[PDB]
């Protein structure tokens, strides 16, 4: 049972700008997704300070980077607070309408796409490198869901029958054909070292057979 939703017009416009603007510095997508994971991990950590049972769904707080050259996917996994179904539908837990307005007002005044995270909509930088993004998520207060979009103005949400996650979020980037450098170990290592040196959770780069 799959539900299909239209993006709000402002979010569709954000996504088309990310997809269509000539902009070479695409590697910032990974910094933005790792920063989102760190934010989600901070949230579950904070809740656990007054209620240890919040970690009954998993005590480890970490970020895993999983490249798969056969599937042409880069997956960013975190064990943060996750998202409810309502969060997914409401722009993946962001205030994306007001964030997009500010971001586009910053671009016309000289900002560039790399500053997207200052406007709270860094998730959508995934579309710099991915033709399709799948988000699997599990929040303590809801069931496990899969969100998916290839842009084009719509996204889907369905209950996820896949491998149970416990708690957190998995962002699966189905990479564009010309963006496979982001599956190479040395390239991912370089980006993490350059942009994510002060992320306070272990980032494990998985290797492939
Ligand atoms: N959080 C981590 O695992 C890192 C992130 C930056 C690159 C490496 C150096 C120590 C911190 C690993």
Swiss-Prot record:
Q: Where in the cell is it found?
A: Nucleus; Cytoplasm; Melanosome; Cell membrane
What does the entry's PTM section describe?
ISGylated.
Where is the PTM N6-acetyllysine found along the chain?
Answer: 43, 69
Specify which residues bind ATP according to the UniProt entry for this protein. 36, 78, 97, 123
Give the recorded effect for residue 82 to D.
Abolishes ATPase activity
Q: Where is this region: Interaction with NR3C1?
A: 1-209
Subunit composition?
Homodimer. Identified in NR3C1/GCR steroid receptor-chaperone complexes formed at least by NR3C1, HSP90AA1 and a variety of proteins containing TPR repeats such as FKBP4, FKBP5, PPID, PPP5C or STIP1. Forms a complex containing HSP90AA1, TSC1 and TSC2; TSC1 is required to recruit TCS2 to the complex. The closed form interacts (via the middle domain and TPR repeat-binding motif) with co-chaperone TSC1 (via C-terminus). Interacts with TOM34. Interacts with TERT; the interaction, together with PTGES3, is required for correct assembly and stabilization of the TERT holoenzyme complex.
Q: Which family does it belong to?
A: Belongs to the heat shock protein 90 family.
Q: What is known of its domains?
A: The TPR repeat-binding motif mediates interaction with TPR repeat-containing proteins like the co-chaperone STUB1.
Function as written in the Swiss-Prot or TrEMBL entry? Molecular chaperone that promotes the maturation, structural maintenance and proper regulation of specific target proteins involved for instance in cell cycle control and signal transduction. Undergoes a functional cycle that is linked to its ATPase activity which is essential for its chaperone activity. This cycle probably induces conformational changes in the client proteins, thereby causing their activation. Interacts dynamically with various co-chaperones that modulate its substrate recognition, ATPase cycle and chaperone function. (Microbial infection) Seems to interfere with N.meningitidis NadA-mediated invasion of human cells. Decreasing HSP90 levels increases adhesion and entry of E.coli expressing NadA into human Chang cells; increasing its levels leads to decreased adhesion and invasion.
Task: Please report the name of this protein according to its UniProt entry.
Answer: Heat shock protein HSP 90-alpha
**Can you name the source organism?**
Homo sapiens (Human)
């Amino acid at each position: 049972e799959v539900e299909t939703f239209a993006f709000q017009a402002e979010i569709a416009q954000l996504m088309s700008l990310i997809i269509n603007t000539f902009y070479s510095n695409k590697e910032i997508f990974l910094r933005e997704l790792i920063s989102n994971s760190s934010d989600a991990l901070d949230k579950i950590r904070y809740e656990s300070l007054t209620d240890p049972s919040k970690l009954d769904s998993g005590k480890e707080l970490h970020i895993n980077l999983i490249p798969n050259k056969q599937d042409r996917t880069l997956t960013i996994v975190d064990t943060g607070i996750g998202m409810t179904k309502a969060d997914l539908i409401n722009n993946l837990g962001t205030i994306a309408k007001s964030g997009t307005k500010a971001f586009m007002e910053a671009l016309q005044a000289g900002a560039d796409i790399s500053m997207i995270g200052q406007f709270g909509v860094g998730f959508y930088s995934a579309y710099l490198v991915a033709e399709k993004v799948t988000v699997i998520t599990k929040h303590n207060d809801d069931e496990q869901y899969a969100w998916e979009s290839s842009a084009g103005g719509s996204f889907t949400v369905r209950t996820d029958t896949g491998e149970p996650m416990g708690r957190g979020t998995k962002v699966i980037l189905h990479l564009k054909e010309d963006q496979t450098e982001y599956l190479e170990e040395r390239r991912i290592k370089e980006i993490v070292k350059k942009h994510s040196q002060f992320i306070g959770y272990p980032i494990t780069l998985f290797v492939e057979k």
